[PDB]
Design a protein around this ligand. Structure first.
Ligand code: HEM
Ligand code: TES
Length: 407
């Protein structure tokens, strides 16, 4: 086993961390912030295997370190490691019960119906740009990427829009490695009190949206506790806004660095669905997914994940496995045709909202470059920088000069 790798909480060099984990694969020793030792799978072939192995589980009571009360309650990463009972944290027969009404609501068919809505919100956001003074840089993150998927997923769950500025300011702190440990459990307090408030707004006045579809259904021949709903709602609002925002940003960043490919994208030669997929492989929004545990020793290539130890899937590292995609695994090629990446997961927990975000991004990007065909970065590509979020590949801002609307 190669030298232990300590995930930098300031994300000063993601591309090199990823390469190191690549080198230390298939299974690498890793240290999470606060000195917590866990292992990490960093190869494509082997990550598929562990994700479909029933010996690898989400029950934290299987974690040696947690049995032995070694994980501070004040830990910054506790939010991710132990978020409570939901689809995310259980397995096998118990899992299917919490997933099913959510997996049905986000199929290609049942999400096609939201398109009208997404075109609406995009075509608006575009109006608000250009409404800004031309010539002067704009943060494409704050003005376009952030609000769009939030609005969407708010609509989907029927969340009141007057809680947006408050939800923004809370998720900011949840993800930051530089949020002060004494501040943790009044942030989590207020998330809980925020989500409980709007769940009761829904019981009082049930709408057609998915929050209410969970409420009515539980009462008859299937499951769903008062807590399981509340936890399953946080999961859907968090996962479904964070990741997709980053996808959009990252697509825009990729086309900037690769302008020959951008030229062909804008002309139609390369279809947009190939750019979005390649961006997911090459520069996934989710660098690391937290937390599984071996029920017993598992062979992993020529190493062993010892029974009781934590496991991380390093999607960022494995997104450029040359064993999987050949010698060009390190480069953005939007035409890379057979492209069976796992940015969305594998086995039982694989993303149920893949089709939603593929849809949001496949509407919003071509809309933006139809309106602003000259749009390029306002800063050199190397000055762009990751926010301090160890699991996520999030940029701080994306300043661009729009360059006059040919819409
Ligand atoms: C670019 C966008 C996205 C990426 C890269 C992404 C990635 C992932 C990954 C890797 C997982 C697996 C978690 C694990 O195996 O431990 C996952 C699970 C999940 N994602 Fe996504 N996701 C995206 C968008 C969304 C959206 C839009 C929604 C909801 C509308 C969503 C909801 C979920 C849920 C509910 C789970 C848990 C499913 C389960 O545990 O069975 N995600 N996502
Ligand atoms: C844990 C969590 C649900 C699961 C989310 C997590 C944000 C990070 C994230 C990104 C993914 O790619 C999968 C879903 C996860 C792992 C969310 C933060 C709050 C919410 O309860």
């Amino acid at each position: 086993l190669m030298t232990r790798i300590a995930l930098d909480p300031f994300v000063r060099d993601l591309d090199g961390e990823s390469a190191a984990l690549r080198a230390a694969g298939p299974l690498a020793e890793v240290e999470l912030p606060g000195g917590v030792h866990v292992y990490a799978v960093t190869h494509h072939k082997e990550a598929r295997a562990l994700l479909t192995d029933s010996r690898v589980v989400k029950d934290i009571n299987v974690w040696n370190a947690w049995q032995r009360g070694e994980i501070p309650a004040d830990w910054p990463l506790i939010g991710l490691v132990n978020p409570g009972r939901s689809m995310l944290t259980v397995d096998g027969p118990d899992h299917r019960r919490l997933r099913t009404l959510v997996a049905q609501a986000l199929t290609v068919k049942r999400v096609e119906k939201l398109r009208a809505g997404i075109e609406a919100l995009t075509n608006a956001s575009l109006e608000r740009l250009a409404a800004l003074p031309a010539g002067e840089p704009v943060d494409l993150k704050a003005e376009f990427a952030y609000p769009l998927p939030m609005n969407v997923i708010s609509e989907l769950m029927g969340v009141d829009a007057a809680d947006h500025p408050r939800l923004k300011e809370l998720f900011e702190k949840f993800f930051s490695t530089q949020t002060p440990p004494e501040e943790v459990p009044q942030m989590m307090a207020d998330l809980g009190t925020l989500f409980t408030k709007i769940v009761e707004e829904k019981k009082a006045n049930p709408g057609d949206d998915l929050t209410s579809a969970l409420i009515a259904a539980s009462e008859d021949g299937d499951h769903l506790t008062d807590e399981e709903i509340l936890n399953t709602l946080q999961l859907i609002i968090a996962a479904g806004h964070e990741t997709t925002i980053s996808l959009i940003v990252n697509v825009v960043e990729a086309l900037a660095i690769h302008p020959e490919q951008r030229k062909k994208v804008l002309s139609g030669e390369i279809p947009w669905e190939g750019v979005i997929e390649e961006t997911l492989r090459w520069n996934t929004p989710t660098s690391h997914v937290l937390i599984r545990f071996a029920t017993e020793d598992i062979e992993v290539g020529d190493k062993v994940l010892p029974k009781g130890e934590g496991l991380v899937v390093s999607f960022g590292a494995l997104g450029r496995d040359e064993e999987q995609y050949g010698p060009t695994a390190g480069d953005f090629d939007a035409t890379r045709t057979p492209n069976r990446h796992i940015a969305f997961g594998h086995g039982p927990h694989v993303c149920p909202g893949a089709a939603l975000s593929r849809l949001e991004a496949g509407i919003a990007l071509p809309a933006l470059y139809e309106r602003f065909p000259e749009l390029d970065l306002a800063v050199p590509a190397a000055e762009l920088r990751n926010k301090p979020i160890v699991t996520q590949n999030d940029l701080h801002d994306l300043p661009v000069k729009l360059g006059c609307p040919f819409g």
